[PDB]
Structure formats: C-alpha cells, structure tokens
Amino acid sequence: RETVGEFSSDDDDDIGTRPPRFTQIPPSSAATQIPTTLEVTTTTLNNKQSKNDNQVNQLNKAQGEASMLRDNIEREKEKNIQAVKVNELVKHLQELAKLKQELQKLEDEKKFLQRGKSKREVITNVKPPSTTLNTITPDSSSVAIEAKPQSPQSKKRKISDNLLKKNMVPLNPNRIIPDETSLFLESILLHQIIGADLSTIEILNRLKLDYITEFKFKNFVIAKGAPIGKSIVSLLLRCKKTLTLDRFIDTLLEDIAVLIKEISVHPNESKLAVPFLVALMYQIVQFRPSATHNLALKDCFLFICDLIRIYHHVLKVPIHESNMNLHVEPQIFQYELIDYLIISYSFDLLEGILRVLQSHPKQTYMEFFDENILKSFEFVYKLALTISYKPMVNVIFSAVEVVNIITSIILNMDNSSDLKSLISGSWWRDCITRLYALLEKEIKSGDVYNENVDTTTLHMSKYHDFFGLIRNIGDNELGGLISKLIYTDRLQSVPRVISKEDIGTAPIIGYKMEKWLLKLKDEVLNIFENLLMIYGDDATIVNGEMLIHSSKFLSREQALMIERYVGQDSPNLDLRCHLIEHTLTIIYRLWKDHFKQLEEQIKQVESQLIMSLWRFLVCQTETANEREMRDHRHLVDSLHDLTIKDQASYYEDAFEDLPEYIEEELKMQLNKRTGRIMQKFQEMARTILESKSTLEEADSLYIS
Amino acid sequence: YAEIQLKYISLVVDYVCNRTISTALDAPALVCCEQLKFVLTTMHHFLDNKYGLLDNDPTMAKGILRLYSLCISNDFSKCFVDHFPIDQWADFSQSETNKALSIVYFDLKRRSLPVEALKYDNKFNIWVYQSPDSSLKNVTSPFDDRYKQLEKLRLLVLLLKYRVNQLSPFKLILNEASVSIQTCFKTNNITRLTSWTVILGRLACLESEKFMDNWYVCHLCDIEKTGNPFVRINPNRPEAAGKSEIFRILHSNFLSHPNIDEFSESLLSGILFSLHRIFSHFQPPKQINKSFKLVQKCFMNSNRYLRLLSTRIIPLFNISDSHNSEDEHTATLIKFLQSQKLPVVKENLVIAWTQLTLTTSNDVFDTLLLKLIDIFNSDDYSLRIMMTLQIKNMAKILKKTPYQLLSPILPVLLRQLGKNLVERKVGFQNLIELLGYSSKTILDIFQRYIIPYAIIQYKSDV
C-alpha cells in the first residue's frame, strides 16, 4: 500500500530500462477502490516522462483500457496524456493523431448497426467525447485558435447520429424515423439575425426591387412591386413538394445566386436585399452538410468570390484624409452599413464553404480545387490585408481562417493539392510575406477602439462592429440598428436613414475586444507549424528566415510583458504568456529539425536572438516555498482567481464537491499561472539551442 | 441504456459552457451562437421524448437551469425563448414532469408582466400575485444546485473593488483602514496584512480622481496606450507630502521601522506595486527618508523577480515639475546607477538606463543616449549583446528607425573613430551592423565631419 508509492515516489526523484518494466508495472498495478491508493500511479509517469520515455501509442493504448473501466475521474487520464500530447516537439505529431481518429470511426462505425455486448460500446463514446471536450489539449489535431476547427463540427455528426439509436426503442419497435426536411423549412423560415427583431424572411417579407421591373430565371418570377419575400416562401413550398432533401438545398441555392447577381450588377436600384440574402444563404450552406454539397460549393464560391470583386471601394479606401476635405455633408450612415454588411457577410460565407468542404470524405477534396478557384481567391486575400490602405478588422479574421483551413487540410488528406498543382511559389510566398506585416502590430489593450494611424495597432473602429456570422467578434453597439433601417410598414426599397451622430460608460469592453483580438496572434502561429511540416524546406518559403521575424517578435513581448504589464490585474496576461510560450516551439523546431536554414549567416539577428534564449535560461536559479506563493495571487492573479472560484459556485466542472486529492492539483496549477505571469519542461528545450551551435565570450553569459 | 441516456446531456450540457468566453466577474458569455443552436435542440428533443429517468434528479434540473444562467436577460434571451418552449408541457393544475423547471418558468413570466407586480416579501425581487408561487420558495439541499437557483431568483434586485473590502469584512474607509490596518499590522501577518497593501494603492488610483459607485481599473494606472508610457504622466501634480492621504497612511506604518530591512519577503514587493501607483499620481517627496532607501535595498537583493520589479520605479523619481525638474534630482539617479558594477545585476542595470533616456528629452537626452552606446556597446560581451537589444527595441516604442534615432550621437562618436581610424577598426564595424547601412555608404554620407579631424590631428597615422 503506502510503501510501494513511498518507494516509487522516492525512486523517481532519485533520477534506462530500469523503469521500463516499472511503467509497465505501474500500468499493471493500475490495471483498487481506494482513491489515495491509485492517484499516484499515473503521477509517476509524469515523473518518468521527463526522459525520452515517450518514444509509442501504447501509453495511449494503456490509457485505452484504464479510463474505460472507471467510466472525479474525468481529468485523471487527460492531463497525464497531455504530457505526451503537448510533447509533440513532425512524424510523431501526425501519426499520434491517426490512432486517435481510427479509435473514433471504428468505435462509431459498428456502433451504428446495433445484446449487452454493445451495451458498453456507447460508454466508450461517453469517454472519447468527455476527453476532447483547448487549454487542456492542443496536440497535433484539428486545430484553430478560435471556433470551428473541424473536430468541433464532426461532433455534430456523432451527437446527432447518437440520437438515432436512442429513439430506436428498447427493442426497436415502431421505427419513428427522423423528420425528413420538415426542419430545414422552419429553420430557414424562423432564422433570427442575432440582435435584430423580425428575423430575415419577414424583414425580407417587405422589400421591392424597383428600377428593374421584370425578373425571371427558372420557374421563379418577381415583377414590378410586391415583396421580395413573397416569391421566396413560394419557392420554398414549390420545391418542398418534389425536391430531394439533397438537391433541394442546391437548386434552391442556385437561384438565390443569380437573383443577387442581377441586383448586384448595378441597374439603378439601391441594393438592400443583398445584405440579408447573403446571410440567408449561409443558413442554407451549413444546414446538414454531409455529402449533400458536392460541387454546389464550387459554383457558389466563384460567384461570391466574384461578388466580392464588384465591391472594391469599401476595402480600398485611402489611409489619409485631405486637409482641404472638410466634413460638412448629411453624414448619413445607412449607405455605409449596407456597404459593410455585404463585405463582411461574404468573408464568412467563404469560411463557411471551406469549413463545409473540410467535412467531406477522404479523397473527395481533390475534386474542388483547381487553378480557376485558387487564382480567383488570391485577389480576395491580397485585397484584404492592404498595407497601402485602411485596415478592416472584421475580414482579417476570416481572411486568415482560409489561409489556415487549407493549410490544415493540405497536410491531412495526402497528395498535397494534387502535388500542389496550383500553388505558385510566387503566389504562395506572397500570401505569407503579407503576414509578416501583421505580426508587428502590438494591439495595446486600451487604444483598441480609438482612431489613430495604422500599423500602430489593429484598432477596430466603432462604426463597423457587428457579429458577422460564424463568431461574435465585438460588442456590436450597433447590433440593434440593423433593424432600424427597414421601416416595417410601407414595404420600401430605400433605407430609413440612420444618422451617424447617435451611434455609440465602461472600459471593460476594451479588454474583451482586446482578448478576442489577441487570439488572432495565437492563430498566425498555427499557420506556421503547418507551413514547416509540408514543404520540407526546399522552396523559398522557409529560406525567407522566419527566425528573423519570429525572434524579433519573441524578444519584444519578453521586453514588454516583464516591464510594463505584470501586476496590473488584467485578464489578458495569462493568454499573452501562453502566447509567448507557444512562440518558442515555432523557432525551437525550426532550429532543431533543420539547422541549415536552407541565408547562411544568422548574424542579422544574432543579438536579439540570444537574449531571447537567455531569458528562459535565467529561470535556472528557480520563491520555492508555498506560503509565499499564495501571497502573490492577491497582487497579480486576483482576476483569474475570481473566475476559478466562480466556477465551483455556479457552473460545476463535474468535479469540485470534495476532490480532496485532485483538489491539490488546483493547488499545483495556480503556481504555474503564478509562475509564467512573472517568470520548465521548456527550459530543457531552451538550453538545447545554443550548445548545438566565441567560447571565451560564451562563459560570460553563463557567468552573467 | 438507463444511465447512458442521462449522461449525454451532461456531456453536452456542460460542454457548451466550457467554451464560454469567461471574462470572470459577474457575467459569463458565449462565443459562437451556432453552438447554443446545436444544443438547445437536442435538450428539447431529448426530454421531449421523455425517457431514461433514473430519479435522484442528478442532472436535468441543473442543466436546464445551467443554460438559462448564460441567457437570463442577456442578448441571447430570445435565443432561449423560441427554441426551448416549456409551454408545451406547461400544465398548471397547481400540480406544477420535473419540479425544478417551475423556477425558470417563474422568472420568464416574471420578466414579462413589467408594469406593477408587487414588493418582495421574502426579499426576492418583486413577487407577483399567484393562485401558488410557493413552489419556488426555498430549495432542497443538493449543494451545487442550491446555489444556482439562488443566483437566478435574485437577479432582478440592484464591482471588483468592493470584493476585497468584502473579502475581509471615502473618509470612513480611511479611518476604517488606518485604525484597522495598524491593529491588522501588529501581530504576525504576512498575508492578512499584504491584502491591505494592494487595496491601499487602488484607493490612490481612486483618490487621484479628486483632482465611489462605479470605479475599477484606473485609466492611467492600469491601461496601456501606444506612445511613450512616461509622457502620459503629468509632471506637475499633487505633492505626496501633505496632499496624499494614503501615502501618509503607508508611511508611518510600513516605511520606517527596524523590520523593513530584513522582513516582508513577499510583502516587501507588496508595498512596491502599492508605492508605484502612489507616485504615478503623486510627484514623490524630493534621501527621501526611508523610501528611496527601500529602492536601494530592493534593487540590490539577489532574487530576480524583486530586482526587475524595482526598475519600474526609477523613472518616476526622475520626472517632476516643481522641485528639481532637470536639476540635480536627475543627477543623483545617475551616480547611483553609475555605482553598480555587480556581476549579478547586469540585466537590471541595462533596463534602467533605457528608462531614464525615455524620461528625459531635449539636451539631456542627447547626452544620456550617448552614454549608453558609449560604454554598453563596448568590450564586455556579457553586456554588449543586451545593449544592442534595448536601443533597437526602444526605437520601436517611439517609432523611429535606429538610424533616424541616432542622428547627432553619430557626429560626436564618429570623430573619435576618425581619430583612431583603422588601428582600432573594431568599434566602428561593430556599430555599422546596428545601423544596417553599408559602411561605405554611411561614411560617404558623413565624410564632412571626419576629414577636418582626420589627416591633421593624430599625424602618427597619416
């Protein structure tokens, strides 16, 4: 009992194959009913994993059985698996995902066709779902820093499909069956616009195209006056009769395309229906994607990617305003607001496509991509990030997520873009050389909403903030004006004339938009790791020496975080440090797996690069006793305390009644949070950078 | 299949909350609205088929209550109203499938009627006349649920800083503090005391507003902006001597004493942050009794964290209007920092000078900037690296290019190099790397300055 672990704990701290059986024996010993007995059996591995003992999937295959049996035990095999999960620092990064995926499908597949033999096979789903369900994982996987990220949507494949079996009775009698397309009609019909009353199909139940009298395409007709919404609810009910649930959403969608197009190509009618229709098209695209959409995405994409091209003058506006341009005019905001909505809502629909395409089977991807689709895209992205023109912070997210999602899908399904049939070094490298400009804007948390020059910071001006579609980006003070332009009686074409004076007392909304902005720089990182995996350094992409731009970013935060921030009690810190710690693996792996940098000399950055490495290694000396450690939290962590004590009050974590043993974990973790705000396993990685390679001058730093 | 059912709610029920945006404080919040749209259905479609009820009321009650917490009056109210419609099963015969719901049905209609309602008898919001309402009443003790309803039922009745006051239960608070803290000081507290250390300074960042209800994160103290941070302070501002209440409270208490030398291992840091906010609003007292001695003692100690924390203070002693603006009070700081040779200091010493440079301007800045590049770019290698980081990092702050940053300092330096010329041939080529221009370019741009001093003097090298 108490002796075995007394020795085991004494054995670990005392530090080849001597424990190779011990881990196996630990796994054996773990394979009683006393909480305090088993708790240390896994904790030993974390003391045994500080070696190369990760090596493969057996440590996972040992986690395979153990957790299943115990199905306060949730996080038990999670964090200890996070030890080798975040341990990813190429090969062992990708492969270690496959053993995670095939342990789903095979656990899912035969789980469809279902005596008590399979009665447990659902419980195995109660585990693999209760593990993944981002701060306690982030191992090579489906990856993005903010929302979607696939394996979040694929859960909506399962969790619904696991509502099938449940409703399949105790002995499967009657066979109700799903509701067919009855839902898809009411959904699109009931669709709220999130922050404005009247929904859409009703707020579109009064609009009349005017200067274009006669419109027709195929069994679809709008004429003279009458609402642009009355024809719709017809076209829903018409196709509702004879249309297959899969083609329905297409031949429906293929219409709304050409409609918007005719309004799009300027006749003489102010375009108020496009802001709503585009939105309504999004609700169409995502509904139950499955294999439904095939090429319907493609023809949708080239359209929207073209439609975004008809609209320039929103995103190409000049940076500086003429002194001799005075501002005296009506100052009307409602012809801007329709300009912005169509821009934004487009750039989601782009992301809406790819995220859907990413839900389609193994080799099905190669169908879509072609020089036609990708060339068209460059003129969108290359249009978004400017550097000659005013930034716009609503597209920048969605402008990146594409550049992400493709580079996340490229690695997955093999035979890269058909061996990168259309990817041009001139094309590709251009798309990256335009991100280097991004990283260099420091987003000071309090200057967010203010006006100032660009390249200073990403400001996100108040005039355009609204939730977009996919994600709610900012507090959208005008989230409720979008219902103030529609009148609501007369059935009118032209807007109701909002005024710019009255649009938009607490700072706190400063922090949120800051934090929610900071993720974007926890994204552009995860662009890079993909980029390093794929091309194998041959092309000119890595030779551009991101270690120049990485380190120059790395060194900066290490300067500002330490000087001007720590101690001011803001929620952003914990993310900013978790940013900087991630930033090291960007270079660390770049250095280690290559070291040839394809530019010979590093003498460009050889100053800022060392002081980077230095500052981690200064932690060598390593405030050890505990009573001191709680002292600081009051000065620093107080916010992050306010939430962590807020959980166990309102929102249980499925722990926290009396997790007396794991309760000490809560005692442990808060020290790292205490630690990496002020400034480990990374330290050993740090020192490994210099010793691989003036030795006389070298001792001075060690002496320093 | 009895339990497996009831579990997949608490898989998703507690799923959608874990991806909330947090933000701590009193309001949770959610990111992707589509998420809540892929759950509220499958909670509806679950309980609606009405199967799998193993009693114990473990989950469904909390969950159907837990989601309503995210919404309440929040912008997602309607997102809750339309999808999860209870009026389906509503069924008021006075017998009301589950007895937890009635609370949330209470609140819903309770926020509906508006208009009059009635006053709170139990101290719950404003009650309504019911045919009864006593199903809500008091909660059975399930623990984590018993708090939940309490949080929901009281939401109608009407700040961070008040937490620390309530953590240990303005003229009142002062005489509350000053009388208490000294009693709180006397007998054996590192912690209970150091709690006061922070709430002191906060008051100062509040007290500066004299030149209650809603205050947190003082705008100057706690929030960044993109310029030079030390041009945001006002040089002329209340003298901390007699016009700073808190400062006084802290002075006679933590600032003299036999103990301040060796004591207060973490606590000593406490007064520092506290001391910072004080001076940031208060031009400090121009030895300055024990205060500046503390910075001495602090700066010297061999623990890393405490050192780097003291560097933050130094620039505050620099900037002042009134007494000794550009006068000696800047010079004393020079000599002290000039005094430290210690091999451990290092990183401190370099961080310091950069700060003073930022604080100064005009003619002093031009001299001081020289002194950095003078010595700190010279021989010692354990040093010269970092001096190349800072000034190249400082350039980003005030947003000039390092070459544009220099200007003047080059005509003064370059004459000396031109004096020694190629017999030296080190400091020069070490410098050109920093500016990045070609060495042939820089000289032929500056050649007017070197040649009058080149061939004539130091004729040893012609």
Side-chain angles (χ1 to χ4, degrees), chain A residues 5 16 19-20 26-27 30-31 35 62 64 66 83 97 116 128-129 138 144 147 149 152 170 172-227 229-242 244-268 270-361 363-365 367-404 406-413 425 427-504 506-536 539-563 565-585 587-597 599-621 624 626-651 653-679 685 698, chain B residues 2-4 6-37 39-91 93 97-111 114 117 132 142 159-169 171-238 240-247 249 251-258 266-323 326-386 388-418 420 422-439 441-459:
Chain A
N172 91 99
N174 145 242
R175 185 176 179 83
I176 215 291
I177 208 169
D179 296 344
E180 296 180 354
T181 184
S182 175
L183 300 180
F184 176 78
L185 179 60
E186 71 183 349
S187 173
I188 186 172
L189 185 66
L190 181 60
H191 173 62
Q192 196 67 60
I193 198 166
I194 183 173
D197 51 355
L198 283 73
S199 69
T200 56
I201 207 68
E202 177 62 14
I203 197 169
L204 197 144
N205 198 343
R206 54 188 64 83
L207 292 174
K208 61 178 181 181
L209 46 76
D210 192 2
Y211 296 140
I212 179 64
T213 59
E214 180 66 14
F215 173 77
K216 183 169 176 286
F217 179 82
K218 187 175 179 181
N219 287 339
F220 180 81
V221 174
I222 294 171
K224 295 179 178 179
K230 185 181 70 65
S231 175
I232 300 300
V233 62
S234 174
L235 176 60
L236 296 178
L237 298 174
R238 302 179 187 177
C239 295
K240 174 60 167 61
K241 301 291 178 63
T242 184
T244 61
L245 173 58
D246 296 346
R247 291 181 59 82
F248 178 79
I249 69 173
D250 185 2
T251 190
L252 189 149
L253 192 152
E254 182 68 14
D255 181 1
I256 290 101
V258 62
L259 189 151
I260 300 169
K261 184 68 178 296
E262 192 282 338
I263 296 173
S264 70
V265 145
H266 165 247
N268 252 315
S270 295
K271 308 174 178 70
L272 200 150
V274 180
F276 296 96
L277 289 171
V278 176
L280 185 144
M281 180 175 281
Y282 179 82
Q283 172 49 58
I284 298 165
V285 177
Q286 68 176 18
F287 183 77
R288 300 288 297 177
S290 294
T292 64
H293 304 71
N294 310 134
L295 64 83
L297 301 175
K298 186 179 174 64
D299 293 343
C300 175
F301 197 102
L302 292 177
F303 168 75
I304 184 62
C305 180
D306 185 6
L307 174 63
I308 190 63
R309 179 175 181 172
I310 294 174
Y311 296 94
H312 291 291
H313 53 287
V314 177
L315 296 173
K316 287 169 62 182
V317 293
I319 180 61
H320 189 64
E321 293 178 350
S322 295
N323 55 33
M324 69 174 285
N325 183 337
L326 41 77
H327 312 295
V328 55
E329 282 173 350
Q331 294 296 98
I332 58 170
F333 179 72
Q334 78 277 358
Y335 286 87
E336 299 304 324
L337 182 63
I338 296 169
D339 296 343
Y340 291 140
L341 294 177
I342 173 60
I343 301 302
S344 176
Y345 285 101
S346 174
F347 284 91
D348 283 350
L349 186 148
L350 297 172
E351 187 280 337
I353 298 301
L354 292 172
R355 185 67 64 184
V356 167
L357 189 148
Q358 185 176 349
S359 293
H360 287 83
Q363 297 176 336
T364 57
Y365 306 128
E367 178 182 2
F368 177 81
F369 293 94
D370 186 4
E371 296 179 352
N372 187 26
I373 190 67
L374 191 145
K375 290 179 178 177
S376 65
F377 170 77
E378 185 184 6
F379 178 70
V380 173
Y381 168 84
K382 183 178 179 180
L383 190 149
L385 299 180
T386 64
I387 78 172
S388 65
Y389 292 137
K390 292 180 68 66
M392 180 172 175
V393 181
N394 287 284
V395 300
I396 298 169
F397 294 91
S398 178
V400 170
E401 187 72 12
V402 174
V403 183
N404 190 33
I406 65 105
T407 59
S408 176
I409 202 66
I410 295 301
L411 294 178
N412 231 8
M413 243 351 71
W427 181 85
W428 181 269
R429 180 175 61 82
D430 184 7
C431 292
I432 301 304
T433 54
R434 193 178 300 274
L435 292 182
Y436 292 94
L438 185 145
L439 282 74
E440 294 181 349
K441 301 173 180 179
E442 282 301 319
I443 68 167
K444 305 303 180 182
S445 64
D447 194 11
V448 177
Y449 287 91
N450 190 28
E451 63 181 342
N452 64 344
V453 300
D454 63 351
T455 65
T456 297
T457 181
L458 302 171
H459 54 286
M460 179 63 176
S461 179
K462 293 178 177 178
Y463 291 151
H464 55 80
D465 51 349
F466 42 80
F467 286 163
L469 287 176
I470 176 171
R471 66 186 70 85
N472 302 134
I473 296 168
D475 195 12
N476 72 349
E477 296 178 349
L478 61 79
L481 293 180
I482 187 167
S483 178
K484 297 299 285 185
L485 56 78
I486 196 62
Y487 202 83
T488 60
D489 290 343
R490 293 175 185 172
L491 181 138
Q492 75 293 0
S493 68
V494 299
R496 201 182 71 190
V497 185
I498 299 173
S499 297
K500 185 184 288 292
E501 292 296 320
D502 293 348
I503 175 60
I508 180 173
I509 58 101
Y511 287 156
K512 284 185 291 187
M513 170 60 77
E514 190 282 335
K515 176 194 291 180
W516 183 255
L517 187 155
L518 178 56
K519 299 287 181 61
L520 193 152
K521 290 185 177 74
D522 197 3
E523 186 72 13
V524 297
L525 301 180
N526 287 340
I527 290 174
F528 288 168
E529 286 76 354
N530 293 340
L531 266 59
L532 292 175
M533 297 291 186
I534 169 172
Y535 285 90
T540 62
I541 58 170
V542 182
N543 188 30
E545 302 308 319
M546 64 184 79
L547 69 86
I548 292 173
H549 290 84
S550 72
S551 59
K552 285 179 177 178
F553 173 78
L554 172 60
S555 295
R556 185 185 297 174
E557 288 180 350
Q558 292 183 337
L560 295 175
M561 177 67 180
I562 185 170
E563 179 176 359
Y565 286 101
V566 176
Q568 66 182 21
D569 291 348
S570 180
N572 301 340
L573 298 177
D574 188 3
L575 175 61
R576 192 188 298 271
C577 61
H578 184 285
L579 184 147
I580 194 67
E581 184 174 2
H582 180 280
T583 60
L584 180 60
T585 60
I587 177 173
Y588 174 74
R589 300 179 67 252
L590 172 63
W591 182 261
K592 183 170 173 289
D593 288 347
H594 296 80
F595 177 75
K596 62 172 293 181
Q597 292 84 2
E599 181 179 1
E600 293 179 351
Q601 78 289 359
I602 310 301
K603 297 176 181 177
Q604 183 67 63
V605 298
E606 187 175 0
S607 63
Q608 294 178 336
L609 174 58
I610 301 301
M611 179 55 68
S612 67
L613 300 174
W614 173 253
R615 195 177 302 277
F616 282 94
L617 195 144
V618 181
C619 186
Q620 180 64 261
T621 60
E626 67 283 3
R627 59 183 296 173
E628 298 80 354
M629 195 68 75
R630 186 181 65 192
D631 299 343
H632 304 289
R633 290 208 301 266
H634 301 289
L635 296 173
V636 172
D637 189 69
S638 64
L639 291 176
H640 180 278
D641 185 7
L642 177 59
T643 187
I644 192 66
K645 183 179 169 61
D646 192 6
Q647 293 179 337
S649 60
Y650 304 142
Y651 305 135
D653 292 347
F655 301 117
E656 294 173 350
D657 183 6
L658 178 63
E660 182 278 334
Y661 52 103
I662 299 300
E663 189 280 336
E664 190 277 336
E665 181 70 14
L666 177 63
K667 300 299 287 185
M668 289 298 297
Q669 184 178 353
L670 270 64
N671 296 344
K672 290 178 179 176
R673 300 290 182 268
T674 300
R676 295 298 172 192
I677 297 171
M678 57 165 279
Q679 285 176 329
Chain B
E3 185 66 15
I4 297 295
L6 193 147
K7 194 74 176 297
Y8 281 145
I9 57 175
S10 62
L11 171 65
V12 173
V13 166
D14 287 347
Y15 163 75
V16 65
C17 62
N18 286 338
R19 288 187 178 177
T20 52
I21 196 172
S22 66
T23 63
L25 296 175
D26 300 344
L30 181 61
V31 286
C32 182
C33 59
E34 181 279 341
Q35 289 301 102
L36 184 61
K37 296 289 181 62
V39 51
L40 287 176
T41 294
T42 189
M43 296 304 296
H44 189 64
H45 179 280
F46 180 87
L47 177 60
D48 190 4
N49 288 340
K50 184 180 178 180
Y51 62 86
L53 279 66
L54 293 178
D55 182 5
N56 288 336
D57 188 68
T59 302
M60 67 190 89
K62 295 162 60 181
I64 306 303
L65 178 57
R66 175 163 290 112
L67 290 179
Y68 182 74
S69 64
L70 292 179
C71 300
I72 309 172
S73 65
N74 192 340
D75 193 6
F76 299 105
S77 65
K78 294 178 180 178
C79 179
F80 172 81
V81 177
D82 64 14
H83 286 82
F84 192 101
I86 65 185
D87 287 346
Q88 293 289 321
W89 305 283
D91 181 3
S93 64
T97 181
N98 183 26
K99 53 185 175 296
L101 300 174
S102 300
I103 292 95
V104 72
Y105 172 65
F106 173 77
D107 292 347
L108 289 180
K109 182 179 170 62
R110 184 170 70 82
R111 299 185 182 277
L159 174 58
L160 177 64
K161 178 173 175 288
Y162 298 154
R163 178 177 180 271
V164 175
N165 287 339
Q166 292 178 333
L167 176 62
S168 62
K171 293 179 177 179
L172 296 175
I173 300 169
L174 300 178
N175 288 337
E176 289 298 322
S178 177
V179 176
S180 62
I181 63 169
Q182 191 61 260
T183 63
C184 295
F185 172 82
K186 288 191 295 185
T187 59
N188 199 30
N189 288 289
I190 59 170
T191 59
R192 295 181 180 274
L193 190 145
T194 191
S195 62
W196 288 96
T197 58
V198 62
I199 186 61
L200 296 175
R202 302 294 183 276
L203 294 170
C205 291
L206 186 149
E207 182 64 17
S208 61
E209 290 182 352
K210 304 307 285 186
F211 300 96
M212 289 296 293
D213 178 7
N214 54 343
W215 180 94
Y216 60 96
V217 298
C218 181
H219 62 79
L220 171 59
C221 299
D222 199 357
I223 287 174
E224 292 300 321
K225 289 179 70 68
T226 62
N228 183 28
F230 299 103
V231 73
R232 186 169 178 79
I233 297 170
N234 191 31
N236 56 343
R237 65 183 180 278
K243 294 169 65 179
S244 66
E245 168 31 33
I246 14 289
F247 163 25
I249 299 267
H251 185 283
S252 296
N253 294 335
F254 314 100
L255 268 67
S256 63
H257 296 282
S266 66
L267 167 60
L268 180 58
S269 178
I271 187 62
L272 292 173
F273 293 109
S274 296
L275 185 62
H276 173 56
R277 290 175 178 272
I278 293 170
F279 293 156
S280 179
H281 296 287
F282 291 149
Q283 63 181 21
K286 111 299 238 6
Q287 184 63 257
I288 307 172
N289 197 32
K290 306 295 186 294
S291 68
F292 179 79
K293 180 186 79 177
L294 178 56
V295 177
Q296 300 292 98
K297 184 66 178 296
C298 182
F299 181 85
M300 295 298 293
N301 188 340
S302 180
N303 63 343
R304 181 187 183 180
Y305 168 71
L306 187 61
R307 290 184 292 105
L308 293 165
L309 200 155
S310 64
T311 59
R312 182 179 300 175
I313 293 175
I314 294 299
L316 299 176
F317 291 159
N318 188 341
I319 54 102
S320 66
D321 191 3
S322 297
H323 59 282
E326 292 182 351
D327 292 345
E328 73 285 0
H329 185 61
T330 59
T332 299
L333 300 174
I334 298 169
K335 291 178 296 301
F336 167 74
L337 186 64
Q338 185 61 61
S339 176
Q340 304 300 99
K341 292 164 62 181
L342 299 176
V344 179
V345 172
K346 294 301 182 181
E347 306 294 311
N348 288 339
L349 171 63
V350 175
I351 300 300
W353 288 94
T354 59
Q355 303 301 101
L356 295 173
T357 60
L358 297 175
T359 61
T360 60
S361 64
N362 290 335
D363 300 344
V364 179
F365 180 82
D366 295 344
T367 64
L368 183 65
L369 190 151
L370 172 64
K371 190 171 183 179
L372 190 146
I373 184 170
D374 184 6
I375 178 66
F376 295 161
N377 201 30
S378 65
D379 188 8
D380 185 4
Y381 180 79
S382 61
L383 180 67
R384 61 178 297 275
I385 298 299
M386 165 166 54
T388 60
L389 179 144
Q390 288 298 320
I391 186 168
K392 184 186 294 179
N393 181 32
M394 174 180 70
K396 294 295 178 65
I397 300 302
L398 56 84
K399 295 175 181 176
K400 293 175 180 176
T401 61
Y403 171 75
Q404 183 68 61
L405 175 61
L406 280 250
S407 221
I409 271 252
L410 295 175
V412 176
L413 291 176
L414 184 61
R415 66 182 295 176
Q416 294 179 337
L417 299 178
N420 291 336
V422 69
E423 295 303 319
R424 183 58 180 164
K425 187 63 174 172
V426 175
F428 176 84
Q429 186 59 60
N430 189 29
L431 183 146
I432 306 302
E433 183 69 15
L434 184 143
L435 276 68
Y437 289 144
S438 297
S439 64
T441 295
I442 177 173
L443 184 142
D444 290 342
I445 294 172
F446 299 160
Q447 189 172 357
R448 181 181 62 195
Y449 300 134
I450 60 171
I451 57 173
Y453 303 131
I455 57 175
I456 303 302
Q457 190 62 261
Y458 296 97
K459 193 65 173 173

